[PDB]
Amino acid sequence: LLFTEAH
Amino acid sequence: MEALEWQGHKEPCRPVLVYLQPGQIRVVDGRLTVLRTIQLQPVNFVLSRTLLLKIPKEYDLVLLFNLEEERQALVENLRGALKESIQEWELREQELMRAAVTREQRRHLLETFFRHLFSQVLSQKVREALTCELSRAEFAESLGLKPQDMFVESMFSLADKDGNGYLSFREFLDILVVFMKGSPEEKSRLMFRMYDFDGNGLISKDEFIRMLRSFIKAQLAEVVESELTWEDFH
Amino acid sequence: GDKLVSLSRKKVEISVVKAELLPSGVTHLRFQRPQGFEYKSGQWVRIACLALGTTEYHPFTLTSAPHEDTLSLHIRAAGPWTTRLREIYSAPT
Amino acid sequence: YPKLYLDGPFGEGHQEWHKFEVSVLVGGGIGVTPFASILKDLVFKSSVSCQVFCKKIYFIWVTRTQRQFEWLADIIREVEENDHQDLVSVHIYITQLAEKFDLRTTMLYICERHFQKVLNRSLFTGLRSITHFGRPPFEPFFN
Ligand SMILES: Cc1cc2nc3c(=O)[nH]c(=O)nc-3n(C[C@H](O)[C@H](O)[C@H](O)COP(=O)(O)OP(=O)(O)OC[C@H]3O[C@@H](n4cnc5c(N)ncnc54)[C@H](O)[C@@H]3O)c2cc1C
Numbered sequence: 001l002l003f004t005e006a007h
Numbered sequence: 008m009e010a011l012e013w014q015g016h017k018e019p020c021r022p023v024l025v026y027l028q029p030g031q032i033r034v035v036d037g038r039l040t041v042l043r044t045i046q047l048q049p050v051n052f053v054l055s056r057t058l059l060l061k062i063p064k065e066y067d068l069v070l071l072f073n074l075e076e077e078r079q080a081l082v083e084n085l086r087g088a089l090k091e092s093i094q095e096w097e098l099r100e101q102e103l104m105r106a107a108v109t110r111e112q113r114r115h116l117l118e119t120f121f122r123h124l125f126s127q128v129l130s131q132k133v134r135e136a137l138t139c140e141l142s143r144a145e146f147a148e149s150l151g152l153k154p155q156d157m158f159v160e161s162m163f164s165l166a167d168k169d170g171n172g173y174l175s176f177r178e179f180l181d182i183l184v185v186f187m188k189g190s191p192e193e194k195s196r197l198m199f200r201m202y203d204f205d206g207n208g209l210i211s212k213d214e215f216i217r218m219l220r221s222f223i224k225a226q227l228a229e230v231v232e233s234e235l236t237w238e239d240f241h
Numbered sequence: 242g243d244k245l246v247s248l249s250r251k252k253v254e255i256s257v258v259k260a261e262l263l264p265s266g267v268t269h270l271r272f273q274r275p276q277g278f279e280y281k282s283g284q285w286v287r288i289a290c291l292a293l294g295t296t297e298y299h300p301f302t303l304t305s306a307p308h309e310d311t312l313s314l315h316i317r318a319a320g321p322w323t324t325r326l327r328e329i330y331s332a333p334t
Numbered sequence: 335y336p337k338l339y340l341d342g343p344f345g346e347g348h349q350e351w352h353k354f355e356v357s358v359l360v361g362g363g364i365g366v367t368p369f370a371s372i373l374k375d376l377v378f379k380s381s382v383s384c385q386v387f388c389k390k391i392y393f394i395w396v397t398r399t400q401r402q403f404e405w406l407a408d409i410i411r412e413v414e415e416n417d418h419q420d421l422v423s424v425h426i427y428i429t430q431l432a433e434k435f436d437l438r439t440t441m442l443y444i445c446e447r448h449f450q451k452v453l454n455r456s457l458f459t460g461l462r463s464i465t466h467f468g469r470p471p472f473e474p475f476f477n
């Protein structure tokens with residue numbers, strides 16, 4: 001799955 | 008009638024026209040494009056060809072005139088217009104100019120207001136900013152949305168506890184802490200209170216479809232089909 | 242500078258779908274369209290054929306419409322390179 | 335309305351994303367205005383045509399605040415509503431520091447993470463897209 005997670 | 012509107016030392020003045028409704032005062036550009044509308048509810052004046060009308064909640068409205076006689080005529084008409092539904096001072100041009108808070112100063116005051124509000128949700132200038140009430144137009148502009156938008160109207164009416172047409176620091180802080188730290192039941196209650204226009208404790212099918220369209224005719228009705236009280240909505 | 246600009250472009254490499262020896266010494270070449278090849282009517286491309294051992298690029302107008310799936314060229318037998326191209330593409334395989 | 339004088343397109347609009355089956359479009363600051371037209375054209379092209387080589391488009395919007403670009407939210411809303419093939423996946427990254435939030439940024443934050451959706455759409459904006467707060471992870475995303 002897409003790993004869209006801002007720092 | 009014609010007049011000149013001053014928006015600070017840096018911002019140039021512009022030619023405007025002033026209209027006097029029975030309860031409202033309109034400042035509208037010469038193109039007939041509406042610029043500002045203020046409502047009077049049961050304001051102070053400063054005289055200098057300069058007329059400084061101090062709005063207790065919004066930024067002050069100052070007018071420059073070609074001749075002193077035009078300003079005198081305008082103040083004579085405005086005294087009668089406002090008396091139908093009052094303090095005046097005599098100050099110099101520099102004193103009147105410095106005694107007014109313009110749009111830029113209001114923006115800075117709102118900036119520190121929001122800074123403190125968001126710092127609390129998660130000192131002379133601080134106290135001065137915290138003692139200001141946000142109008143609906145300012146609330147919509149800070150939200151980045153139009154004044155006539157479903158979200159802004161719903162949130163403004165729901166957050167206005169006293170319903171005076173302006174939103175204060177206390178109401179904003181309470182609604183924001185409800186949004187952030189509220190329990191899921193409390194969040195559902197807040198959403199239910201914001202969703203219903205009439206606020207009669209139930210959501211109509213037409214009203215629910217209106218809320219859905221606010222989130223953005225037959226399609227909305229079909230979606231709603233597949234009243235609803237608090238427990239049902241939750 | 243012109244040589245550097247030419248080197249900057251990347252020359253695609255494709256295969257010929259069909260070769261026709263049309264009369265009056267004409268060669269009709271249908272070849273695979275590059276995946277991202279978009280062009281308008283009247284535009285022309287350059288072609289080279291290593292079978293002649295030349296690496297020479299010659300300009301030819303795209304006779305195929307942009308809505309088609311392959312690219313077509315109608316090359317006239319004008320001189321050495323065109324005649325050699327017709328001779329090499331005369332036979333299959 | 336007054337009449338305008340128009341000087342034609344000077345863009346020289348490379349559309350190299352059509353050359354790739356999967357493309358990632360990254361917009362930042364003021365360099366996100368053309369992406370509205372790009373996304374609308376992409377969704378229209380995928381709606382009218384069937385065998386488009388571009389199977390998936392990723393639009394990574396990166397901004398400090400959405401001020402002066404709130405219309406892009408509505409454009410993205412219409413694009414995702416008209417995306418009948420799941421061609422465009424929109425990811426918004428608000429990089430503003432939490433202390434410098436305006437009203438809109440705080441509303442976005444609470445509606446994204448402190449308020450349930452209705453049809454998987456945030457109550458504030460109405461976007462099915464997920465809005466993040468922080469630096470976009472380009473390396474892990476590409477991985
Ligand atoms: C924009 C453009 C589009 C063209 N499109 C087509 C086409 O669709 N079909 C077609 O049959 N022909 C086309 N030509 C003609 C082109 O010149 C051919 O590549 C040429 O006939 C090949 O010649 P040759 O080397 O086999 O013989 P040569 O003996 O070299 O032919 C001599 C003539 O060909 C011309 N020529 C040779 N080599 C080149 C070169 N590299 N660039 C430009 N001109 C050259 C010379 O001007 C000379 O007059 C086009 C030319 C141009 C400039």
Ligand SMILES: NC(=O)C1=CN([C@@H]2O[C@H](COP(=O)(O)OP(=O)(O)OC[C@H]3O[C@@H](n4cnc5c(N)ncnc54)[C@H](OP(=O)(O)O)[C@@H]3O)[C@@H](O)[C@H]2O)C=CC1
Pocket residue numbers: 362363364365366396397398399429430431
């Ligand atoms: N195609 C082009 O050539 C473009 C060029 N520009 C140029 O960029 C300049 C500044 O753009 P501006 O309008 O201020 O955009 P902004 O800086 O307002 O927004 C750009 C976004 O990218 C982030 N960002 C900016 N710089 C960096 C960096 N060095 N490393 C990592 N992230 C960064 C910012 O986050 P944060 O600030 O929180 O770090 C911000 O959210 C302008 O002068 C403009 O000329 C702009 C757009 C397109």
Ligand SMILES: [Ca+2]
Pocket residue numbers: 140167168169170171172173174175178
């Ligand atoms: Ca109030």
Ligand SMILES: [Ca+2]
Pocket residue numbers: 203204205206207208209210211
């Ligand atoms: Ca109700």
